Amino acid sequence: SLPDLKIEKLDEGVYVHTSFEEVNGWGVVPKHGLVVLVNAEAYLIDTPFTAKDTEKLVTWFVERGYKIKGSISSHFHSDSTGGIEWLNSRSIPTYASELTNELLKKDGKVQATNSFSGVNYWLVKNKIEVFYPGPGHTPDNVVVWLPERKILFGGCFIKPYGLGNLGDANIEAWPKSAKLLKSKYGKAKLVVPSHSEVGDASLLKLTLEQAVKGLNESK
Ligand SMILES: C[C@H](CS)C(=O)N1CCC[C@H]1C(=O)O
Ligand SMILES: [Zn+2]
Ligand SMILES: [Zn+2]
């Protein structure tokens, strides 16, 4: 029996959702996601692994009087995009980078309805920003920045302890992308990784260090 979906407040207008799956060859993997509230509207940062969890997550917010305005997926893997098919079926707007959509189509998965290309994208002006630091954990990975709180959702890019599965990784690119991310978001109050506990800006440094080590052990 896996743990039930968890929803907890991280900051004003910000909640973290945690979902769990048994992953072949990796054991039980926890996935952190965010829900960001603007007025009476709610935005999903990453979907839980499954439609069932995504439906539960949406319901929890709908019950509390919020309209689900949009969803954004950090990268193509199912821990970020699992709910897209369901969200699309409910006509709830879904967002991903053009690269992520290309990779999804490739993986035989349902694509986000809306896509953006380019480094910066403001899902909500002045409140939610998507940033692409370049290839790392995957070619398409992006981070989400909340300026009003200085909270960065690292997603699966942030890897303090180990890089994890390198199957889709760009090992050569990653240290450079990490350096770029650290320079841009060193100011961050909080960093929320996908697969590990919430932390301060130091997670950016650790990720860069891990990325360099991985490339080296790699040579
Ligand atoms: C469900 C995730 C996809 S990012 C996964 O398989 N793993 C494998 C180990 C932890 C985590 C990771 O690569 O970050
Ligand atoms: Zn991944
Ligand atoms: Zn992941």
Residue numbers in the entry: 21 to 239
Paper quotes:
β-Lactam-containing compounds remain the most important antibiotics in clinical use, but their effectiveness is threatened by increasing resistance. β-Lactam resistance is most importantly mediated by serine- and zinc-dependent metallo-β-lactamases (SBLs and MBLs, respectively), which catalyze β-lactam hydrolysis. B1 MBLs (e.g., imipenemase [IMP], Verona integron-encoded MBL [VIM], and New Delhi MBL [NDM] types) are the most clinically relevant MBLs; these MBLs catalyze hydrolysis of almost all β-lactams, including the latest generations of cephalosporins and carbapenems. Crystal structures reveal that MBLs have a characteristic αβ/βα sandwich fold, that they possess conserved zinc ion binding sites, and that loops flanking the active site are involved in ligand binding. We report systematic studies on the inhibition of four clinically relevant MBLs (IMP-1, VIM-2, SPM-1, and NDM-1) and the model MBL BcII by the four captopril stereoisomers and both enantiomers of a captopril derivative, 1-(2-mercaptobenzoyl)pyrrolidine-2-carboxylic acid (d- and l-MBP).
